[PDB]
Structure formats: C-alpha cells, structure tokens
Design a protein around this ligand. Structure first.
Ligand SMILES: *Sc1nc2[nH]cnc2c(=O)[nH]1
Ligand SMILES: O=c1[nH]c(S)nc2[nH]cnc12
Ligand SMILES: O=c1[nH]c(S)nc2[nH]cnc12
Length: 266
DNA sequence: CTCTTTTTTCTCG
DNA sequence: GCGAGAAACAAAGA
C-alpha cells in the first residue's frame, strides 16, 4: 500500500476500534515486532485504543497515553476485523484481541513491521527517518521543494520515492504523478524549471488526495476505486489517449516504471 | 527446472 | 556522499 491505501485503513480502523480495550495479543510471527514481542504484549495488554493516526505510509495506533504502535504494511500487509472464533489463515502473523472481535495482521511476504514507541518519541522517530512533509497544500511547501530539487542531481522518480521531499508516494502514484505533470522519470531534478516544479507539486497533492477520496487502489481498504482512474501504472502497451501513443515500461533505479514517452520527454 | 515480477534498508565499490 | 544491486519473503507467471 501507499499513503492513500494506508489512510483508507486508518479511517476504517478509527471507526471500529477506538475506545476498545485490548484483551490479549498473540503472534505466530513475533519477529515482525522489531521492538520485541514480549515487551509489546506486556505493555499493551489491557490498554485502550485512543486513536489511529498516520504519517506518510506509517500507521500509528495510539494506545494508552504513553505508547504508540507504529505499523508499516510495506508491500502486502493487510488488516482485517474478525470474530473471535475466526479460523487462522496461512499468512496471518499477529492478532489484537478485543472483547467482541479481533484485529488480525496478515502479510504474505512478511515485510511489514510493528514498533512500540513511547509517545514523546514519535516525533523523533520520524525526524530520524527524515520523512518529508505530508502531501497537502498546508504542509507541502513548494519553495523548499524547489530548493531541494535545485541542489540535487538525482533522477526525479527515485528521489520522490525516498520519502524525503514529500511523504507517501510509492511506485503506483509516482508513475501517475509524473504522467500528470508531464515529467520524465529519469529527469535530473536540477534540470527542472520553476513552472514544471509547480505542476509537479500540485499534481502530487491532487493525485494523492483524489486517491484518498476514492478509497485507494485495489481485508480493510479492499473496496477502493482509484484503480479505475490510473492512467499509466500497470498499463504497458495500452493507449495514453494521446493520438495513439502507448504506455512504455522501463526499469528505473530497480523499479518497474510506466510512462508515456510522447508526454514525458526530458 | 530457471528467471523475473510485485517498501524500506543494507552492502559494496 | 553516490548509485547499483541485493536483502528481507512468498507466490505466480514466462
Ligand atoms: S492527440 C489526440 N488525438 C485524439 N484523437 C481522438 N482524441 C484525441 C485526443 O484527445 N488527443
Ligand atoms: O524509503 C523508500 N521508499 C521507496 S518506495 N523507495 C525508496 N528508495 C529509496 N528509499 C525508498
Ligand atoms: O494532455 C496531456 N497530454 C500528454 S502527452 N500528457 C499529459 N499528462 C497530463 N495531461 C497530458
């Protein structure tokens, strides 16, 4: 999932599990709890969920006043709310049991992570990872964005994927964003002119906010509609609606990359 | 059978 | 510092 998918999950969880006391926590794959499963079980059992927040692609469970559970779904992580007698499925790894249901985390590839962080260490946690601003008009300052692009010789797609210029883009939405902003994914950022950076900035915000509104692209959050609106991602050889031009797929910095050459020249 | 394909961090030169 | 490639892992497809 990327930011819109994580936000969709956040919103559904917020509706269902806020106010709920954690009765027990169980793991079949404790190794995904990077801060230590025993510690997390001991600290969180019997606590009440106060809220669910998000920073970039990270889910943040607010559990009691003094702890947060930071969850990353990485490539394939999925949450679901199930009855207490629900059978185990093959790639289920963790469950948070309540009095009247349970929250189960599953992840085929086992990439997703849980970290128990004290409340006053949440802002330092994200500072240490150098996560950039949220993709909103209020938080995403174009002026700083422009200065960082000017000072780098990185290619724009991998630099956007680093999460440092702005938080939340992954492979799908960065491809969508660059098509919308008419920018080549291998464009060196210090070659971008001011008007292109402005369109890029606005496009990042517009695409991600649209995806959030449509419930992401497609367990919780599996009812998304953004997939119907994708212009280039996963559409190799299909039309760009531009006079017969077709989407090409190339590899950029190790990632599958979908773009429309005629639209996205350097 | 092999090889490639699908977020973040780590290693190497 | 940089980029390239690979690591963590599972499953599906060519
Ligand atoms: S360049 C181009 N050609 C078209 N032919 C039908 N519609 C077109 C369009 O929107 N753009
Ligand atoms: O944190 C990252 N997330 C993604 S999607 N791509 C990257 N390339 C380098 N870092 C990152
Ligand atoms: O009208 C457009 N034409 C092309 S070629 N690319 C685009 N990206 C966003 N709009 C367009």
């Amino acid at each position: 999932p990327e930011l819109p998918e994580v936000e969709t999950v956040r919103r559904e969880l917020e509706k269902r599990i806020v106010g709920q006391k954690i009765i027990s926590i169980e793991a079949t794959y404790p190794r995904m709890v990077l801060t230590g499963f025993e510690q997390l079980k001991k600290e969180l059992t019997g606590k009440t969920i106060q809220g669910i927040s998000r920073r970039g692609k990270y889910l943040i469970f607010e559990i009691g006043d003094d702890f947060r559970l930071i969850s990353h779904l990485r490539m394939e992580g999925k949450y679901r709310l199930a009855t207490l007698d629900a059978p185990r499925e093959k790639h289920d790894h963790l469950t948070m049991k309540f009095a009247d249901g349970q929250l189960i985390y599953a992840d085929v590839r086992k990439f997703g992570t849980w970290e128990l962080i004290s409340t006053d260490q949440v802002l330092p946690y994200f500072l240490k990872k150098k996560i950039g601003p949220e993709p909103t008009y209020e938080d995403f300052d174009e002026k700083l964005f422009r200065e960082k692009l000017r000072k780098s010789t990185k290619k724009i797609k991998p630099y956007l994927l680093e999460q440092t210029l702005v938080a939340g883009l992954g492979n799908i939405y960065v491809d969508e964003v660059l098509w919308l902003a008419k920018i080549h994914p291998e464009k060196e950022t210090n070659q971008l002119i001011e008007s292109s950076i402005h369109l890029l900035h606005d496009s990042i915000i517009e695409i991600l906010q649209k995806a959030i509104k449509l419930g992401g692209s497609s367990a919780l959050g599996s009812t998304g509609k953004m997939q119907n609106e994708l212009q280039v991602y996963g559409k190799t050889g299909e039309k760009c609606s531009r006079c017969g031009a077709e989407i090409q797929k190339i590899k950029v910095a190790g990632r599958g990359t979908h773009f429309c050459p005629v639209c996205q020249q350097k």
